[PDB]
Design an enzyme around this catalytic site. Structure first.
Site, PDB file in Angstrom:
ATOM      1  N   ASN A 168      13.976  16.954  17.435  1.00  0.00           N
ATOM      2  CA  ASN A 168      12.656  16.359  17.357  1.00  0.00           C
ATOM      3  C   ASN A 168      12.613  15.152  18.286  1.00  0.00           C
ATOM      4  O   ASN A 168      13.609  14.445  18.449  1.00  0.00           O
ATOM      5  CB  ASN A 168      12.303  15.994  15.901  1.00  0.00           C
ATOM      6  CG  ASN A 168      13.314  15.071  15.249  1.00  0.00           C
ATOM      7  OD1 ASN A 168      14.518  15.168  15.490  1.00  0.00           O
ATOM      8  ND2 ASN A 168      12.824  14.176  14.391  1.00  0.00           N
ATOM      9  N   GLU A 201      12.427  22.798  16.556  1.00  0.00           N
ATOM     10  CA  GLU A 201      12.241  24.222  16.807  1.00  0.00           C
ATOM     11  C   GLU A 201      11.459  24.483  18.094  1.00  0.00           C
ATOM     12  O   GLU A 201      11.863  25.312  18.915  1.00  0.00           O
ATOM     13  CB  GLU A 201      11.531  24.891  15.627  1.00  0.00           C
ATOM     14  CG  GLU A 201      12.188  24.627  14.280  1.00  0.00           C
ATOM     15  CD  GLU A 201      11.517  23.489  13.525  1.00  0.00           C
ATOM     16  OE1 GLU A 201      10.816  23.771  12.531  1.00  0.00           O
ATOM     17  OE2 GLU A 201      11.677  22.316  13.926  1.00  0.00           O
TER      18      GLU A 201
HETATM   19  O1  LIG Z   1      11.646  21.372  10.206  1.00  0.00           O
HETATM   20  C1  LIG Z   1      11.361  20.297  10.740  1.00  0.00           C
HETATM   21  C2  LIG Z   1      10.672  19.262  10.021  1.00  0.00           C
HETATM   22  C3  LIG Z   1      10.402  18.085  10.621  1.00  0.00           C
HETATM   23  N1  LIG Z   1      10.753  17.797  11.933  1.00  0.00           N
HETATM   24  C4  LIG Z   1      10.610  16.431  12.463  1.00  0.00           C
HETATM   25  O2  LIG Z   1      11.037  15.511  11.470  1.00  0.00           O
HETATM   26  C5  LIG Z   1      10.246  14.289  11.565  1.00  0.00           C
HETATM   27  C6  LIG Z   1       9.563  14.020  10.244  1.00  0.00           C
HETATM   28  O3  LIG Z   1       8.303  14.687  10.196  1.00  0.00           O
HETATM   29  C7  LIG Z   1       9.301  14.500  12.740  1.00  0.00           C
HETATM   30  O4  LIG Z   1       9.884  13.989  13.934  1.00  0.00           O
HETATM   31  C8  LIG Z   1       9.177  16.020  12.782  1.00  0.00           C
HETATM   32  O5  LIG Z   1       8.762  16.512  14.035  1.00  0.00           O
HETATM   33  C9  LIG Z   1      11.427  18.731  12.727  1.00  0.00           C
HETATM   34  O6  LIG Z   1      11.574  18.591  13.934  1.00  0.00           O
HETATM   35  C10 LIG Z   1      11.708  19.967  12.076  1.00  0.00           C
HETATM   36 ZN   LIG Z   2       7.590  21.715  13.304  1.00  0.00          ZN
END
Ligand SMILES: O=C1C=CN([C@@H]2O[C@H](CO)[C@@H](O)[C@H]2O)C(=O)C1
Ligand SMILES: [Zn+2]
Ligand SMILES: O=C1C=CN([C@@H]2O[C@H](CO)[C@@H](O)[C@H]2O)C(=O)C1
Ligand SMILES: O=C1C=CN([C@@H]2O[C@H](CO)[C@@H](O)[C@H]2O)C(=O)C1
Ligand SMILES: O=C1C=CN([C@@H]2O[C@H](CO)[C@@H](O)[C@H]2O)C(=O)C1
Ligand SMILES: [Zn+2]
Ligand SMILES: [Zn+2]
Ligand SMILES: [Zn+2]
Lengths: 137, 134, 136, 137
Positions: D45, D58
């Site tokens: 992320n 993802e």
């Molecule tokens: O399954 C997932 C759930 C959340 N996120 C990331 O976690 C942070 C909290 O929302 C954010 O940075 C959000 O993008 C992921 O990248 C994957």
């Molecule tokens: Zn997502």
């Protein structure tokens, strides 16, 4: 005629455009991001059936770089099929670019190889940023 | 724009901030949009557990206005709780603003009432826009 | 459940909301309308952008409108499009925004003739990520 | 003991989490995408001062793969520091995955290596997709 790094930028963005996934807009865009150490990360737009879920060439390139550990960017070039207009980055990409610095160059090009250069700062005046969440300390 | 409108616009933007749903950032933001015929549509930021799915105040207001049949805007004001600096629109909102013109005003304010005005064009120079796809 | 009366109001509201859709790029107009606990209805339509990623869906336009007015209790939301032989289904982004405000409410996926399929938010977004994951 | 591809996925997802740019949420997430020919693309992320401009792990991974010319995906794994809860993909990412197929696997994990696996279809039922926009119907 142009510096070697500019030549690399233009060529990579034009090449990157070939991977574009844009069956909805049929508007292919490619981008090439140059890091401080000389490495180049390329990107292209990747659309989605539900338009809002697509992504632009610039962010695809910036996201790749960061996931690989690179946050120091020198410049990014963009390429499209618009022969008569320099392809410009949308505000969203400008904001993501800004997250990693205001002092780097954006080459807005044309298929013929001509281009305009503006810094992220010029492209996003009085930018909202990390300082707003008191994140710089 | 009429100073009568500017004031109503600035107050509406601050009032809108009260509805902000921002339990993650705890950084509430309000915005007020003025249409060409004097109607005002406000908005606030609405965050989401997965950060990318949140939306900013400006777009919440703009999206509201458009859904009500209005697409001719004259100005938009933004308010936050940040004391030290004028709250300015993020690039995404600037791009949504641009979709409907580059000649309108953006009022970036501070909690005390002071502000700086800039047009959408000045905030998003050499922009990508509808004409690129026409 | 939800009274056939509110469902009809939602249905007519989403269809009417669809008329304001700003979609010169896809030319795929979509309308949406949600029902709050106290019976108030808020509608929305998709609003696209020259740069496709910056557009917004009809459901989020409606939900954000509701929240901006102070409502966060939703009972149901109806979606309508011009897709004749397909129930219009909400995209994943909208399902995730709907989930931020509960998983037990109803989503009405309709066809232009008034026929529809109804599913809960939980059923449209199982084993979901939510506010609770950031608390722990 | 898991199949080799599962171990790679789990490990890569775990490693990719280290590059996460998440100063705002301090919630790091990593993802690994397995293509049909065996190549793995990772992601993490990458947040932004303006929350909405962030991107999930993802999609960082999927976009990386597509930008490189890969669209045949076999599976993707997700990792986080959430100790007692399988990290689940948000609806936005499920929509992007769906753009490239409904019949592939998603591994939702925990730091201890345990996981729950669902196909894109099961995670995004009666989904909106590319065929809903086909000109002729
Ligand atoms: O399954 C997932 C759930 C959340 N996120 C990331 O976690 C942070 C909290 O929302 C954010 O940075 C959000 O993008 C992921 O990248 C994957
Ligand atoms: Zn997502
Ligand atoms: O400078 C840019 C302008 C536009 N785009 C992409 O082009 C398509 C039409 O908006 C969309 O897929 C959009 O993301 C870019 O990737 C970069
Ligand atoms: O269920 C829905 C599917 C799609 N959309 C909108 O339809 C257009 C084509 O993706 C885009 O404008 C997109 O936002 C909705 O508003 C709702
Ligand atoms: O000008 C503005 C700057 C930021 N935001 C919102 O503030 C939070 C922190 O980025 C996020 O919720 C973000 O959307 C706005 O609504 C307007
Ligand atoms: Zn962009
Ligand atoms: Zn914004
Ligand atoms: Zn949607």
């Amino acid at each position: 005629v142009e510096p070697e790094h500019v030549q690399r930028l233009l060529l990579s963005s034009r090449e990157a455009k070939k991977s574009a996934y844009c069956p909805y807009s049929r508007f292919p865009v490619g981008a090439a991001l140059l890091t401080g150490d000389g490495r180049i990360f390329s990107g292209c737009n990747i659309e989605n059936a539900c338009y809002p879920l697509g992504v632009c060439a610039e962010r695809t390139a910036i996201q790749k770089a960061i996931s690989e550990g690179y946050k120091d960017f020198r410049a990014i070039a963009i390429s499209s099929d618009l022969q008569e207009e320099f392809i410009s980055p949308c505000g969203a990409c400008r904001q993501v670019m800004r997250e990693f610095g205001t002092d780097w160059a954006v080459y807005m090009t044309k298929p013929d190889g001509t281009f305009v250069v503006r810094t992220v700062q010029e492209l996003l005046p009085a930018s909202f940023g990390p300082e707003d969440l008191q994140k710089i300390q």
